[PDB]
Amino acid sequence: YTSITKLTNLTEFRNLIKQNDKLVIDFYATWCGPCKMMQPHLTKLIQAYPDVRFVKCDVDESPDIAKECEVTAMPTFVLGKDGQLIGKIIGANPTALEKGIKDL
Amino acid sequence: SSYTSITKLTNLTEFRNLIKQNDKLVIDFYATWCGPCKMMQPHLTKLIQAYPDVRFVKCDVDESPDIAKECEVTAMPTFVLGKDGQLIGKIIGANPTALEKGIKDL
């Protein structure tokens, strides 16, 4: 979990979306229980889907990036496909998350 | 300050009792580490004022994980709505507009 890229500003954010055909952003907060539960799931998905770029973003540290993706709950996983925000998985939901990523 | 006076659900009995003893209810599922949850407080305060026929309570998911589990609370905040002895749906996230709409419809 500690090895994926953390988005910290809008420039990095916009760069990431334009440089990657398939992208997952994990929007979390420090000390968030459901967020932490999802870490080992994300690790496995990273390995299972090497053509998808997984990154993370701390909603308290980066409230502007959160607003830009309309993130209002934690954890939320935002799915990007070819520059578009194509889907959102709200909450610690491994099954919906895998399906969403599978379809990217 | 008004948020501090709100009844906390702390066990499953209180939870089932809440559901059996109130015609209309809202449970604010929050955590102490949750920023957007804190942002919702003034909105919850107002809703409590504005909806006297609806019973409002809160539940700290870390202090009452069994209740949070029963309501499949997987994202913070979550607001669970109840009516006439059953839970009817959830508003998920810091969204006071959607929350008020769900409450208005109770």
From Swiss-Prot, chain A:
Give the lineage: Eukaryota, Fungi, Dikarya, Ascomycota, Saccharomycotina
Name the protein family.
Belongs to the thioredoxin family.
Marked site, Contributes to redox potential value, at 33-34
Taking the first listed entry, what is the main subcellular location of this protein, grouped into a coarse class?
mitochondrion
Q: Which GO terms describe its molecular function?
A: disulfide oxidoreductase activity
Where does this protein reside within or beyond the cell?
Answer: Mitochondrion
Annotated keywords: Disulfide bond, Electron transport, Mitochondrion, Redox-active center, Transit peptide, Transport
Task: List GO terms (cellular component aspect).
Answer: mitochondrion
Give the intrachain disulfide bonds.
32-35
The UniProt record lists the Thioredoxin domain at 1-104
Report the domain of life of the source organism: Eukaryota
BP terms from Gene Ontology: cellular response to oxidative stress
Q: What else is known?
A: Yeast has two cytoplasmic thioredoxins, TRX1 and TRX2, and one mitochondrial, TRX3. Present with 1010 molecules/cell in log phase SD medium.
Q: What is this protein called?
A: Thioredoxin-3, mitochondrial
Residue positions of the active site: 32, 35
Q: Where is this site: Deprotonates C-terminal active site Cys?
A: 26
Swiss-Prot record, chain B:
Q: Name one GO biological process term.
A: cellular response to oxidative stress
Covalent S-S links between cysteines: 34-37
Q: Where is the Thioredoxin domain?
A: 1-106
**GO MF annotations in UniProt:** disulfide oxidoreductase activity
Site positions per UniProt: Contributes to redox potential value: 35-36
Q: Where in the cell is it found?
A: Mitochondrion
Q: Does the keyword Electron transport apply?
A: yes
Q: Where is this site: Deprotonates C-terminal active site Cys?
A: 28
Task: Cite the entry's keywords alphabetically.
Answer: Disulfide bond, Electron transport, Mitochondrion, Redox-active center, Transit peptide, Transport
What does UniProt give as GO cellular component?
A: mitochondrion
> Which catalytic residues are annotated?
34, 37
Give the note. Answer: Yeast has two cytoplasmic thioredoxins, TRX1 and TRX2, and one mitochondrial, TRX3. Present with 1010 molecules/cell in log phase SD medium.
UniProt similarity note: Belongs to the thioredoxin family.
* Protein name per its UniProtKB record: Thioredoxin-3, mitochondrial
Tell me the name of the encoding gene. TRX3
Q: Which residues of the full protein are shown?
A: 22 to 127 of 127
